[PDB]
């Protein structure tokens, strides 16, 4: 995260870290949505253009963490993936469309002060909250500049209207993606960066004081550039696939 700040303990208890086994490495952010299911960006697991292919064996899911590097005794839980599920219409070729993947864990996790599921939006939750000017919250352990923070970072960014998104990049935008960040003339800044992918863009419902994941960190061009905005998988637009996959498996 660029131009963010240390997360307080338990401020983002759904935050998950995707951990490569060999070599031991942080790959990506993810998020907890139930005791058994975790959500992340497709490109984290599969990106041929950089020769990226990870399956169940290659990966660990770490939950309840705050310190990036250190093991956290009696705070953090570690799970292994039973089955990954990339979205079938995920376009790694052009524009990372439907950059989303689900992961079912072998063993369900016990909840605690530090590990707790986020809500996924419904029709109206999306409708009312996903709107130009409303700020959301991005978290992760990615890069502090176009990096390596010691502790989970946090930043709040305003959702941006489509026209400004589309006109900010020559990459073809879709409606499975939204963009967020401060405009050039706003004095505040901040962005996700390389390493933050898979992390949630969350919003607090003023209706029921609950947190909803509206977004997944997907991409951008550099980090924290005036005129550029980070892009997020539109979680709701893909809600049906999510429910679909949960129901079945």
């Amino acid at each position: 995260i660029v131009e963010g700040s240390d997360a307080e303990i338990g401020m983002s208890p759904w935050q998950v870290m995707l951990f490569r086994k060999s070599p031991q490495e942080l790959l990506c952010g993810a998020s907890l949505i139930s005791d058994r299911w975790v959500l992340t960006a497709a490109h984290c697991l599969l990106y041929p253009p950089w020769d990226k292919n990870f399956t169940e064996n290659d990966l660990l899911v770490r939950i309840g963490k705050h310190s990036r590097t250190r093991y956290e005794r009696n705070i953090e839980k570690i799970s292994m993936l039973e089955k990954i599920y990339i979205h079938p219409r995920y376009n790694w070729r052009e524009n990372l469309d439907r950059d989303i993947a689900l992961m079912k864990l072998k063993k369900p996790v016990a909840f605690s002060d530090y590990i707790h599921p986020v809500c996924l939006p419904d029709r109206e939750t999306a409708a009312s909250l996903l709107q130009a000017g409303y700020k959301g919250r991005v978290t992760g352990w990615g890069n502090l500049k176009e990096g390596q923070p010691s502790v989970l970072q946090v930043v709040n960014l305003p959702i941006v209207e489509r026209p400004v998104c589309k006109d900010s990049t020559r990459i073809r935008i879709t409606d499975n993606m939204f963009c967020a960040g401060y405009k050039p003339d706003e004095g505040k800044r901040g962005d996700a960066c390389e390493g933050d992918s898979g992390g949630p863009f969350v919003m607090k419902s003023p209706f029921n004081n609950r947190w909803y994941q509206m977004g997944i960190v997907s991409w951008g061009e550099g980090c924290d550039r005036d005129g550029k905005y980070g892009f997020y998988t539109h979680v709701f637009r893909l809600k049906k696939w999510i429910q679909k996959v949960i129901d079945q498996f």
Partner: peptide
């Protein structure tokens, strides 16, 4: 059905340093 309420925050009526920025944005 317990989702989205933080044990150390909402569940204890405490607020994090910045959540006020979010709610305030909805004006």
């Amino acid at each position: 059905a317990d989702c989205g309420l933080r044990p150390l925050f909402e569940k204890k009526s405490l607020e994090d340093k910045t959540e006020r920025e979010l709610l305030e944005s909805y004006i």
